[PDB]
Amino acid sequence: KFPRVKNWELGSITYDTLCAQSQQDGPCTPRRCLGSLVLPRPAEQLLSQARDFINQYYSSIKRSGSQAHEERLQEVEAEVASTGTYHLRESELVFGAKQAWRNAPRCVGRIQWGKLQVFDARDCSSAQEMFTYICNHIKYATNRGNLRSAITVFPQRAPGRGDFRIWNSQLVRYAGYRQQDGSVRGDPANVEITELCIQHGWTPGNGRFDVLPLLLQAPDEAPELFVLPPELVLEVPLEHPTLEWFAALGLRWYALPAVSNMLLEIGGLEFSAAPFSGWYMSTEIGTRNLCDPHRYNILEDVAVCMDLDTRTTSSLWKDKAAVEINLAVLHSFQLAKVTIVDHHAATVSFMKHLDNEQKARGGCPADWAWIVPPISGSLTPVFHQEMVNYILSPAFRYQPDPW
Amino acid sequence: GPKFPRVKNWELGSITYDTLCAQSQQDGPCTPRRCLGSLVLPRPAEQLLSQARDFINQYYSSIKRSGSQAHEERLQEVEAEVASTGTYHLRESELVFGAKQAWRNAPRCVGRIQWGKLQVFDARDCSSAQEMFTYICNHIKYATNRGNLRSAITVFPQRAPGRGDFRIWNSQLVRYAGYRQQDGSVRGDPANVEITELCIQHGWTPGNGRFDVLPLLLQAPDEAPELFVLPPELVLEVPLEHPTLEWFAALGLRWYALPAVSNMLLEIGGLEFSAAPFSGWYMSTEIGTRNLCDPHRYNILEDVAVCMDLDTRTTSSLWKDKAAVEINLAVLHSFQLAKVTIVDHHAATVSFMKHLDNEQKARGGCPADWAWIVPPISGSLTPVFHQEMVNYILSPAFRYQPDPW
Numbered sequence: 042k043f044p045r046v047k048n049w050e051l052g053s054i055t056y057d058t059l060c061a062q063s064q065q066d067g068p069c070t071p072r073r074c075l076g077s078l079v080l081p082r083p084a085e086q087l088l089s090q091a092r093d094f095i096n097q098y099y100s101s102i103k104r105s106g107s108q109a110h111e112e113r114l115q116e117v118e119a120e121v122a123s124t125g126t127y128h129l130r131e132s133e134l135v136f137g138a139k140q141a142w143r144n145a146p147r148c149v150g151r152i153q154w155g156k157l158q159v160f161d162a163r164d165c166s167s168a169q170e171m172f173t174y175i176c177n178h179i180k181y182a183t184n185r186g187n188l189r190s191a192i193t194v195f196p197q198r199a200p201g202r203g204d205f206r207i208w209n210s211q212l213v214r215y216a217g218y219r220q221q222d223g224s225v226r227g228d229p230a231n232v233e234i235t236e237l238c239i240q241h242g243w244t245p246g247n248g249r250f251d252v253l254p255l256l257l258q259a260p261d262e263a264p265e266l267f268v269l270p271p272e273l274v275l276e277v278p279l280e281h282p283t284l285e286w287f288a289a290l291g292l293r294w295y296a297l298p299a300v301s302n303m304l305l306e307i308g309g310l311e312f313s314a315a316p317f318s319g320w321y322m323s324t325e326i327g328t329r330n331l332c333d334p335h336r337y338n339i340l341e342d343v344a345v346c347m348d349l350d351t352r353t354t355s356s357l358w359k360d361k362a363a364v365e366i367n368l369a370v371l372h373s374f375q376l377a378k379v380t381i382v383d384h385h386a387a388t389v390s391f392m393k394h395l396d397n398e399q400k401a402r403g404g405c406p407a408d409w410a411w412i413v414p415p416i417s418g419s420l421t422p423v424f425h426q427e428m429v430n431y432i433l434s435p436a437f438r439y440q441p442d443p444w
Numbered sequence: 445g446p447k448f449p450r451v452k453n454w455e456l457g458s459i460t461y462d463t464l465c466a467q468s469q470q471d472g473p474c475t476p477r478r479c480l481g482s483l484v485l486p487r488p489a490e491q492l493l494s495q496a497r498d499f500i501n502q503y504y505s506s507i508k509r510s511g512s513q514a515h516e517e518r519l520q521e522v523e524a525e526v527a528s529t530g531t532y533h534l535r536e537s538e539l540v541f542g543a544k545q546a547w548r549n550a551p552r553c554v555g556r557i558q559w560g561k562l563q564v565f566d567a568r569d570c571s572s573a574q575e576m577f578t579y580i581c582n583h584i585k586y587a588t589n590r591g592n593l594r595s596a597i598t599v600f601p602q603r604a605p606g607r608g609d610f611r612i613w614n615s616q617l618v619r620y621a622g623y624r625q626q627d628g629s630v631r632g633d634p635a636n637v638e639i640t641e642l643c644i645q646h647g648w649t650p651g652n653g654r655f656d657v658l659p660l661l662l663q664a665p666d667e668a669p670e671l672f673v674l675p676p677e678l679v680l681e682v683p684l685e686h687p688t689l690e691w692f693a694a695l696g697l698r699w700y701a702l703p704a705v706s707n708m709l710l711e712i713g714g715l716e717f718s719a720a721p722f723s724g725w726y727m728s729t730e731i732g733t734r735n736l737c738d739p740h741r742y743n744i745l746e747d748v749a750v751c752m753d754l755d756t757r758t759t760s761s762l763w764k765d766k767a768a769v770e771i772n773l774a775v776l777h778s779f780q781l782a783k784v785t786i787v788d789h790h791a792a793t794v795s796f797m798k799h800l801d802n803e804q805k806a807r808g809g810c811p812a813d814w815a816w817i818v819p820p821i822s823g824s825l826t827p828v829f830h831q832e833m834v835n836y837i838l839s840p841a842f843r844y845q846p847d848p849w
């Protein structure tokens with residue numbers, strides 16, 4: 042039965058028919074819903090995924106049933122039957138990468154999905170060459186603050202051998218130095234990767250915002266360490282439009298959000314290294330990165346500085362400090378002329394995206410818990426919107442850590 | 445290791461496994477193909493007996509008498525009663541247990557740390573609309589307790605074969621009128637437009653304010669509903685002021701003290717209680733964020749922002765966030781000053797975390813609807829945002845039911 046999907050603010054209703062196109066199970070069953078969980082719980086198979094994807098591609102260019110379409114299916118079929126695998130043409134890769142983003146249920150920025158620079162790095166044969174491609178990506182995507190969405194696709198997994206992998210979870214990560222007294226200096230999210238870096242020969246610093254080097258891995262080789270050139274890593278000092286002492290906090294964040302640990306799956310083929318980047322929504326930095334108790338955890342420091350009544354929850358000191366921190370992020374990025382979007386503008390765009398996709402494809406997979414921002418949830422339109430979550434391919438997926 | 449859902453807390457790094465979900469006898473809306481967890485309304489013969497037996501087993505387990513002679517005798521009693529009459533009836537102590545369990549089982553309620561403290565008024569003798577009203581007034585008086593609020597439920601007679609239901613037509617015991625205007629807008633609470641118009645159709649003379657308390661429309665078996673005005677002195681309200689913004693008081697906003705849901709069905713051992721209103725106390729975000737700030741509710745965000753002199757022309761000033769915070773603070777401050785029980789969303793969610801731990805030990809899990817548990821402002825500032833949750837239907841349960849009209 043195709044789900045009825047309701048918007049409770051507007052009273053409008055849609056039916057999701059796109060979900061019938063899902064060929065991949067999620068974690069929920071009729072007995073229990075596991076929608077809030079962060080992590081998920083032969084040749085004929087490759088052949089049907091490949092054919093389905095080639096069909097998707099030729100349909101997108103309006104060329105279903107054409108000579109080119111029939112001949113491409115034969116090529117794919119021939120290659121799989123002989124070798125157990127196949128290869129994508131660059132145009133198919135570009136279409137596949139955009140579709141993977143379009144299909145990502147946890148992404149509120151999908152209004153932008155058709156605007157993605159795709160770097161084909163499948164001719165990469167060494168960690169050294171990976172570093173070169175990553176530097177070109179960062180340079181292109183950063184664009185002096187006028188951020189442009191981009192993906193670089195390194196060579197696919199092959200049955201015979203180890204994967205190409207970028208060990209770091211993002212291309213830009215701040216060190217987290219664990220103390221002998223358990224506590225952390227820097228970003229506690231990055232304790233493990235920091236220690237892997239030191240262990241692979243990196244000389245650590247001792248600051249709160251030390252940019253990590255990249256550990257890059259070519260198949261069946263020890264990862265290699267590469268320091269990013271400082272001028273490639275654009276950063277924004279954080280200050281507040283009216284609170285003078287805020288800048289004295291010595292806070293900063295990086296411009297470029299680039300996820301580097303996810304697997305890109307297109308037509309059954311798997312790209313274990315395919316880092317992608319857009320621009321930040323302010324709550325990612327202002328709310329999560331800076332205010333999570335297990336991240337930089339600055340709420341109390343800011344509250345004290347604001348002279349708020351910390352003695353009690355009902356003064357709403359946490360809520361007040363968080364708002365000001367989010368404002369400082371927005372102010373500071375605007376001042377530095379670095380692309381950023383606030384959570385109201387981003388969720389308004391997502392509502393438009395939902396409407397675009399309803400008309401174009403008859404639905405849109407969306408993970409409500411991820412779409413709704415971590416402050417002011419019900420003040421955004423997406424809170425009042427019912428959403429259907431399911432897996433379509435092409436897809437970005439999680440994968441095991443390479444160590 | 446375990447073949448039960450693994451549940452992680454990402455703030456603390458701690459892991460549990462929910463084994464309680466094995467006890468679910470009712471399907472929700474999700475399938476392996478697609479998750480429908482965000483939907484608001486998720487899409488008897490020997491059937492009664494097996495539900496009845498399961499509930500009786502639950503009762504005797506809770507008093508540690510499973511397998512006992514008293515347990516086996518009650519089972520026989522129930523099947524005998526069903527055998528001859530088609531239905532059965534609960535002992536008083538069974539109703540009390542069943543009502544607390546239904547609250548304990550409610551995935552959408554963040555206040556469940558309180559589940560063991562519920563005053564259960566047994567109104568299964570009620571035989572008229574007038575008597576329903578007396579019971580409800582008594583419930584309201586007891587629950588409100590001059591501002592020192594106490595959780596209560598009043599249970600009216602169960603649904604019976606081929607006989608009409610007891611129903612309360614209003615969705616809550618206290619509701620503000622919503623009057624549709626000529627221009628298409630609403631004065632009062634747009635949530636209550638339909639029930640307002642139904643009160644008018646049934647003979648209520650409407651006011652014209654923003655906070656007019658509605659009458660109750662009460663229905664006894666196979667009769668037209670009857671209209672009852674709540675004595676104004678029974679309905680405690682709190683005028684809203686702000687601790688530092690002196691003009692906020694001039695806005696004339698207010699809310700009532702007692703949150704009392706009256707349109708849900710209480711199901712216990714297959715028996716169905718179609719009128720069983722229950723009340724607690726408010727979490728401040730229900731009033732200050734949803735009721736006052738929803739675009740389709742009182743919608744006051746812009747008015748407050750304008751008074752605070754914020755830049756309302758651009759999303760990036762965070763004018764909405766700043767105004768909502770102050771409205772929420774006004775709610776807490778005003779209830780505190782008025783000595784009326786209220787709980788903020790930080791304190792509520794902290795206590796729900798304690799509840800989750802209690803239930804892990806007591807029952808091996810706790811059904812919880814993440815979208816409902818996470819507060820509508822400051823989500824990730826609260827510990828529940830970082831907590832994975834497993835949602836499933838246990839019985840006894842509170843359920844939605846069709847509107848009487």
Ligand code: HEM
Pocket residue numbers: 142145147148149150151153157190191192300317318319320321322325382387411437
């Ligand atoms: C255009 C700028 C973009 C904005 C404002 C945006 C917005 C977001 C936000 C707010 C999240 C949640 C992040 C978190 O909570 O940590 C997210 C996640 C995601 N986004 Fe987008 N996004 C953008 C570009 C992209 C691009 C270019 C791709 C792929 C090519 C993408 C794919 C994803 C994926 C796969 C996730 C989930 C990541 C994970 O699960 O760890 N995003 N995005």
Ligand code: HEM
Pocket residue numbers: 547550552553554555556558562595596597705722723724725726727730787792816842
């Ligand atoms: C003791 C103080 C209590 C607090 C602070 C509390 C808190 C809450 C909150 C914040 C919600 C979400 C409501 C919304 O978003 O509109 C809720 C829903 C719910 N609560 Fe509790 N609660 C309390 C007592 C109770 C009692 C006594 C019962 C039943 C005996 C109960 C059963 C429920 C049910 C069934 C829902 C879902 C309502 C619906 O789906 O319409 N609560 N409660």
Ligand SMILES: Cc1cc(N)nc(CCCCCO[C@H]2CNC[C@H]2Cc2cc(C)cc(N)n2)c1
Pocket residue numbers: 079298299300302303317318319320321322325439440
């Ligand atoms: C493209 C893009 C745009 C934008 N605005 N922001 C980003 C950054 C997304 C960062 C997401 C990282 O998620 C981690 C940390 N919190 C939840 C967790 C989920 C997860 C788990 C795993 C194993 C991998 C992964 N990528 N993500 C990327």
Ligand SMILES: Cc1cc(N)nc(CCCCCO[C@H]2CNC[C@H]2Cc2cc(C)cc(N)n2)c1
Pocket residue numbers: 484703704705707708722723724725726727730844845
């Ligand atoms: C006991 C209690 C404590 C407390 N703090 N707050 C309350 C009030 C809960 C009111 C819940 C109302 O929910 C309505 C309005 N928004 C979603 C919708 C869900 C719903 C639908 C239907 C058909 C019935 C119903 N009871 N609830 C009750």
Ligand SMILES: C[C@H](O)[C@H](O)[C@H]1CNC2=NC(N)=NC(=O)C2=N1
Pocket residue numbers: 077078079410411412454829830831832833
């Ligand atoms: C347990 C819960 O699912 C996690 O805390 C989720 C909640 N929602 C979330 N939403 C987003 N956008 N990013 C997150 O990391 C995130 N964490």
Ligand SMILES: C[C@H](O)[C@H](O)[C@H]1CNC2=NC(N)=NC(=O)C2=N1
Pocket residue numbers: 049424425426427428482483484815816817
């Ligand atoms: C579409 C979405 O499920 C609704 O807007 C939900 C989200 N979470 C919610 N949570 C709570 N506590 N009450 C709600 O009314 C509510 N509405």
Ligand SMILES: [Zn+2]
Pocket residue numbers: 069073074075076474478479480481
């Ligand atoms: Zn689900």
